[PDB]
Amino acid sequence: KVFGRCELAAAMKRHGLDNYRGYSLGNWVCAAKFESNFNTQATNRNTDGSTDYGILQINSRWWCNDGRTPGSRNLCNIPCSALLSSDITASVNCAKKIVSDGNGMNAWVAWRNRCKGTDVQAWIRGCRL
């Protein structure tokens, strides 16, 4: 599923990401934009052999199981393929764990490099949220 901008904002909010660990909705929408371009089915291989999955490009080394990442943990206790569903529940549950891990949203390098410090509220402009 390729989400619309306000559509993903509404789902993220309904799932409780707005102000989660102090990160405003615009931060989460921004991260999704540059991680996946709002495409739930986005997958991207990492140099280390792991793969990122879904709207927030969650990695198979620590967070989800994809059967092909040696020495992997599955701390969200989900198959990585579940992070590609049209329903973002599994991605959101897992993202809550990731962001609570100690480094906040810096865990998303694209967030750090492209969203952090910027006018993130622009990502939710025009939305009936």
d(CA 25, CA 32): 11
Q: How far is the CB of 22 from Cl ion (least distance, A)?
A: 6
* CB nearer Cl ion, residue 12 or residue 105: 105
- Is 66 annotated in a binding site? The answer is no
d(CA 83, CA 63): 11
Contacting Cl ion within 100-129 (CB under 5 A): 104
For 41: left if phi > 0, alpha if psi spans -120 to 50, otherwise beta; the answer is: alpha
Instruction: Please identify every residue annotated as catalytic.
Output: 35, 52
DSSP letter assigned to residue 45: E
* CB nearer Cl ion, residue 79 or residue 104: 104
Contacting Cl ion within 75-104 (CB under 5 A): 104
d(CA 26, CA 6): 10
Phi, psi of 26, deg, nearest 5: -60, -30
Q: How far is the CB of 120 from Cl ion (least distance, A)?
A: 14
Q: How far is the CB of 82 from Cl ion (least distance, A)?
A: 26
Q: Quick check: 23 and 124 in contact, CB under 8 A?
A: no
Residue nearest Cl ion, CB atom distance? 104
* CB nearer Cl ion, residue 24 or residue 85: 24
Binding residues for Cl ion, rule: CB under 5 A, are 104
Annotated binding site for substrate: 101
